[PDB]
């Protein structure tokens, strides 16, 4: 596998590591999303320590309004992050 293919696999792997913890196994609830960000995105995003920030991030990502972040909505988040990284080069 190429670096791009490895990246594709890592996206799938990390989403499901967190989404499968509790409740719906195919979606991230607030606590699963918070832990994903805090543990896995610490070089790109400040640690989330406040409920209001958890709530706002979920509200931002939950495009379909069901209160959880599904895989499509997670991919849109990843695109936001990758796009923002352009500021650094």
């Amino acid at each position: 596998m190429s670096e791009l293919e490895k990246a594709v696999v890592a996206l799938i792997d990390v989403f499901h590591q967190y989404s499968g913890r509790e409740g719906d196994k195919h979606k991230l609830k607030k606590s699963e999303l918070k832990e994903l960000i805090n543990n896995e995105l610490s070089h790109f995003l400040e640690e989330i320590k406040e409920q209001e920030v958890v709530d706002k991030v979920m509200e931002t990502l939950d495009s379909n309004g069901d209160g959880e972040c599904d895989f499509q909505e997670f991919m849109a988040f990843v695109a936001m992050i990758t796009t923002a990284c352009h500021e650094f080069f």
Binding site: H43, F44, L45, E46, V53, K56, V57, T60, M80, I81, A84, C85, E87, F88
Partner: peptide, 9 residues
């Protein structure tokens, strides 16, 4: 690589 939260939210 710190992205300001305000550019995400």
């Amino acid at each position: 690589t710190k992205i300001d939260w305000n550019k995400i939210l």
